[PDB]
Curated annotation (Swiss-Prot), chain A:
Residues of the full protein shown: 1194 to 1243 of 1342
Protein species of origin: Escherichia coli O157:H7
Positions bearing N6-acetyllysine: K7
Protein name: DNA-directed RNA polymerase subunit beta
Oligomeric form and interacting partners: The RNAP catalytic core consists of 2 alpha, 1 beta, 1 beta' and 1 omega subunit. When a sigma factor is associated with the core the holoenzyme is formed, which can initiate transcription.
Role, per record: DNA-dependent RNA polymerase catalyzes the transcription of DNA into RNA using the four ribonucleoside triphosphates as substrates.
Family designation: Belongs to the RNA polymerase beta chain family.
Taxonomy, superkingdom: Bacteria
From Swiss-Prot, chain C:
Whole-protein residues included: 697 to 796 of 1342
Species, as recorded: Escherichia coli O157:H7
Source organism superkingdom: Bacteria
Similarity field: Belongs to the RNA polymerase beta chain family.
Encoding gene, per UniProt annotation: rpoB
Full protein name: DNA-directed RNA polymerase subunit beta
Function: DNA-dependent RNA polymerase catalyzes the transcription of DNA into RNA using the four ribonucleoside triphosphates as substrates.
Subunit field text: The RNAP catalytic core consists of 2 alpha, 1 beta, 1 beta' and 1 omega subunit. When a sigma factor is associated with the core the holoenzyme is formed, which can initiate transcription.
């Protein structure tokens, strides 16, 4: 089912794409995963430790 | 030694923001060098204008609410961070907003000066939900480059400001997204040449020709201290 | 909101009693950043009063771990409201879904 | 750089550097530049780059 | 525009071929732009002269051998790439090598001319075990650009070679190694600016600073059609 979704929006089925590089402009040798995680703060801030 | 030079050829405005710039001919191995050099210096060193102080009457700090306004004031500040102006002569201006009556308050009815160009006049700022409500604001607009937060500015400055100036973070750079592409060109018998195609997505405030010329200028100026001396 | 959840966002966001839920049906009368006044339907009005409910939202307030509690109105002016809906998102909700 | 419990070194390279050292020094059967000759490590660097 | 530009601090020379150059301070993120542009220009696009094509007597193919020579011919065709040459008048010219007897065959024993300079006369080519053996070959040297291997050339050429023509890798560009490196520097209040430390190593025919300024000139001369 998840692969049917991925193929409905014209995205690669395997899940991983080609990433270039930022500093030199070359291509990374191999495909790389890309997606959308959902992540959280936590209140162990630094301004309360130093 | 068959060196050859590029010339800016074609500009094709897809829309009011998107734009594609072609550039040829380039000998082999020079598509990527120029492409990546000026990709790196367009995303960080362009000059543009953005809002940096807001004064709204009858409000003391940025955590209160107001009579007959949908948003609380943090939301008004976070909506003002992203309007796009274009200033011709000065380097700082004071704009004024003033409205009354039910309805949405958009950016169209900033009382324009003589030489301030507002790009999108259909960008919403507030909502007024009562017939007696009114709102009146004084915005300041400056010029600079890069990213400058509010903490740095408050700690640098020694000047004293009253209870009621509210400081906003600034984000001056106008260019949003940029991606280049190298393709094979056609010249009479030289099949060795190339062509470069840069596609550029920004708000208003920059006409692309000027963007590429400024990038090339600062690159050549940087190399100058690197040719002559040793 | 979260793009991938397990269907039980809405129950935790509502039953935790931190979002202001409608008390009786009606159509919204006056919406402001710090109170909403709603006018009940005729069928739900018992004949004593005139039938208006008034919700006073709680703006910035201390939570006893030293963080901020505030509420935002979630409906526009002049649109109907049925009993059991939400009228004001809480500290960490979004249209009645726990968004954390 | 030698632990006093038993003289085994205590700066073993840990977990990410070893994968780089392991991806450099391996051999594929087809890649390119198969079977041409060089004059030192320096021309190998130039060719790879 | 409130630009910032550097003051070339150090050039500390190790020998006639090595060098390393620091430079400080540059705006944030201008280390990598300059380093990368320079490195690509140096490796791929400099002009120079070097040996391409060889004619050895009594040799037919890359595998064979010639009696009275300590090497194979693979060792000869490797020893014959580092031969650094300077031609000033022509675009291509031909050398002839003729030797006999016992002894290492250095580069000085070659038939030299007026307009061609060999910058390391001590360079070795081959040995001769048997004093009854001689060697006689002729070498082709051409002027070009970049780096061009031999498989590409032989795929390109279908010409019916006189059986005995062997083809070498060219190494036109006069740079052995270049590598840059970017690390952090400071100006009074700001601890973001970058210092750049390039490290360069070329053969003869060019002193390093000469190579760097010629490369920078190539790139600026490319850009000259936009600034104005």
């Amino acid at each position: 089912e998840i692969k049917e979704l991925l193929k409905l929006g014209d995205l690669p089925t395997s899940g991983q794409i080609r990433l270039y590089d930022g500093r030199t402009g070359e291509q990374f040798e191999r495909p790389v995963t890309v997606g959308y995680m959902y992540m959280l703060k936590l209140n162990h801030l630094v301004d309360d430790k130093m | 030694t068959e060196f050859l030079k590029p010339r800016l050829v074609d500009i094709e405005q897809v829309s009011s923001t998107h734009a594609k710039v072609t550039l040829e001919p380039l000998e082999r191995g020079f598509g990527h060098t120029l492409g990546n050099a000026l990709r790196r210096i367009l995303l960080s060193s362009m000059p543009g204008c953005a809002v940096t102080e807001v004064e709204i009457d009858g409000v003391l700090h940025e955590y209160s609410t107001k009579e007959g306004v949908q948003e609380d004031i943090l939301e008004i500040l976070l909506n003002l961070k992203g309007l796009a102006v274009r200033v011709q002569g000065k380097d700082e201006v004071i704009l004024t907003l003033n409205k009354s009556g039910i309805g949405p308050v958009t950016a169209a009815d900033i009382t324009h000066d003589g030489d301030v160009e507002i790009v999108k006049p259909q960008h919403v700022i507030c909502h007024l939900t009562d017939e007696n409500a009114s709102i009146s604001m004084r915005i300041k607009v400056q010029r600079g480059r890069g990213y400058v937060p509010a903490s740095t500015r408050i700690h640098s400055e020694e000047d004293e400001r009253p209870i009621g100036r509210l400081l906003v973070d600034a984000c001056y750079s106008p260019v949003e997204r940029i991606a280049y592409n190298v393709e094979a060109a056609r010249v009479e018998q030289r099949t060795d040449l190339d062509k470069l195609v840069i596609e550029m997505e920004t708000n208003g405030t920059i006409d692309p020709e000027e963007a590429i010329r400024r990038a090339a200028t600062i690159l050549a100026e940087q190399l100058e201290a690197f040719v002559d001396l040793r | 909101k979260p793009l991938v959840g397990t269907g039980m966002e809405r129950a935790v966001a509502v039953d935790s009693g931190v979002t202001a839920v409608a008390k009786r049906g009606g159509v919204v009368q006056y919406v402001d950043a710090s109170r909403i006044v709603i006018k009940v339907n005729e069928d739900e009005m018992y004949p004593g009063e005139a039938g208006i409910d008034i919700y006073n939202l709680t703006k910035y307030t201390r939570s006893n771990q030293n963080t901020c509690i505030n509420q935002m109105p979630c409906v526009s002016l002049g649109e109907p409201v049925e009993r059991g809906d939400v009228l004001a998102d809480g500290p960490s909700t979004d249209l009645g879904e726990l968004a954390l | 750089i030698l632990s006093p419990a038993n003289g085994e070194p205590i700066i073993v390279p840990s977990q990410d550097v070893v994968l780089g050292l392991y991806y450099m020094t391996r051999d594929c059967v087809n890649a390119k530049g198969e079977g041409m000759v060089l004059t030192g490590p320096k021309e190998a660097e130039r060719l790879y780059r």
